[PDB]
Structures are given as C-alpha cells and as structure tokens.
C-alpha cells in the first residue's frame, strides 16, 4: 500500500524505451543474437545480464537505469560488426554498397546525438524545488519556517516533503 | 606498422577528451539555467549527511 504509491516502482509503457535509447533499442536484441552465434564465456555473461535486466526493467521503471549499460555494450557490438564489413575498403558496386550502408548508420549516429541532447534539455533538466514559467513557493515557505519559528519546532506534513524540510 | 599505432593512440586520446566534454556539457543544463541547487528528495538527505560528515568527524558520522 506504500510501495504501491511511489511513482518509481511502476511498470513501463513502450514509448519510454524509445525515449531513453533512440536507436540502441533495436540494435540491442541484434547484438545479443550476434553474441549467441559466437558463444564465449564473456558473451554468456552479457547474455544473462541482458535477459535479467530486460525483465527487471519492464517490471519496475527505476530498474531501467541498470538496463542502460548492457544495452550500450550490446549495441556497440552489433554496430561494430557492421563496420567491420562496410568500413573495410580492401570495384565500383561494392564500394557503392559499402558507402550506402555505412552512411545510413552514420546518419543514425548523428540523429542519436541530436535526440539525446533534446531529451536531456527538455525532460531531465529541471529541479523540483523551483518551477519555471519563476515560481518559487517551496523555498519561500521553507525559509520562512527557518527564519520565524523556534529552533526546536516540530512540523507535521506528508512524508513526500520530509527530507526537503 | 608503427605509425599506425601512434596514430591510434593520439586518436584515442582526442576521442576521450571529446567524450568527457560531451558528457559534462550535457549534464550542466540545470545548473546553467536556474542555479547550482539541490534537486528532488533523496539528494537532500544525502546532502545533509555529507554536511554532517564534513563539519564533524568520521567517528561522529
């Protein structure tokens, strides 16, 4: 009844997986599949990590953080494999196809950079104690409590605002 | 070859410099916009505990 009320312990909808990883979200399963076709012990570690954190991240949103490292790793494998074939210039048609593939994925890289910067500037760059419009009503009442109340005074409130007080 | 190794080392150094720069510039948005202030709720307990540690000793903490 309490763990059920905190917003950080709730399941995740699908858009939030694309919002937090632009195109690494469909390179992550491919990189896991590609780690299975060359099974080494280190790769088995990555596969187990991938599966477990995939489940735990969709069941609780606060556990998505733990999923973000392995994704990158997995993605960085898949992409790397692609670049081992189409960034290796060592004949017109083959050169043209290599250029097409590598250029499309480089475009995806630049778009990843842009999307990440926008998501950071828009969603994850605001404090909860000051609201923009500035509306600063928390710090005004907290500083009033700090200035015009006895030092040994007990303030009752909901638990959400405990620490801040 | 040998020039290849030196080229790769210099390139890796420059790449890691750019990585550090990108990371820090991406994080500095809220500090640049409003002020250097403490965020959400658990960081406030963390900050009050760090203050208590740096004012008193380790034994008291």
């Amino acid at each position: 009844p309490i763990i059920a009320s905190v917003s950080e312990h709730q399941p995740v909808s699908w858009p939030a997986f694309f919002f937090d990883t632009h195109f690494l979200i469909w390179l992550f399963p491919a990189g896991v599949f590609l780690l299975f076709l060359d099974l080494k012990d280190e790769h088995v570690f990555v596969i187990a990590y991938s599966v477990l954190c995939s489940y735990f991240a969709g069941v609780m949103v606060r556990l998505m953080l733990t999923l973000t490292p392995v994704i990158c790793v997995s993605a960085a494998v898949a992409l790397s494999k692609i670049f081992d074939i189409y960034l290796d210039f060592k004949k017109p048609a083959a050169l043209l196809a290599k250029l097409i593939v590598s250029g499309s994925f480089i475009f995806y890289l630049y778009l990843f950079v842009f999307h990440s910067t926008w998501v950071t500037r828009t969603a994850y760059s605001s404090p909860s104690v000051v609201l923009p419009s500035l509306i600063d009503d928390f710090r005004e009442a907290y500083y009033w409590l700090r200035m015009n109340s006895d030092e040994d005074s007990k303030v009752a409130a909901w638990w959400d605002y405990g620490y801040q007080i | 070859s040998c020039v290849l190794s030196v080229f790769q080392t210099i390139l890796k150094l420059v790449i890691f410099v750019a990585i550090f720069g990108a990371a820090i510039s991406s994080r500095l948005f809220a500090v640049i916009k409003f002020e250097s202030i403490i965020h959400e709720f658990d960081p406030w307990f963390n900050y009050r505990a760090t203050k208590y540690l740096v004012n008193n000793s380790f034994y008291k903490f």
Partner: peptide, 6 residues
C-alpha cells in the same frame, strides 16, 4: 519518476 507519492 522520483521517491514520491503519485
């Protein structure tokens, strides 16, 4: 998503 009621 923080350690707060919803």
């Amino acid at each position: 998503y923080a350690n707060a009621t919803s």
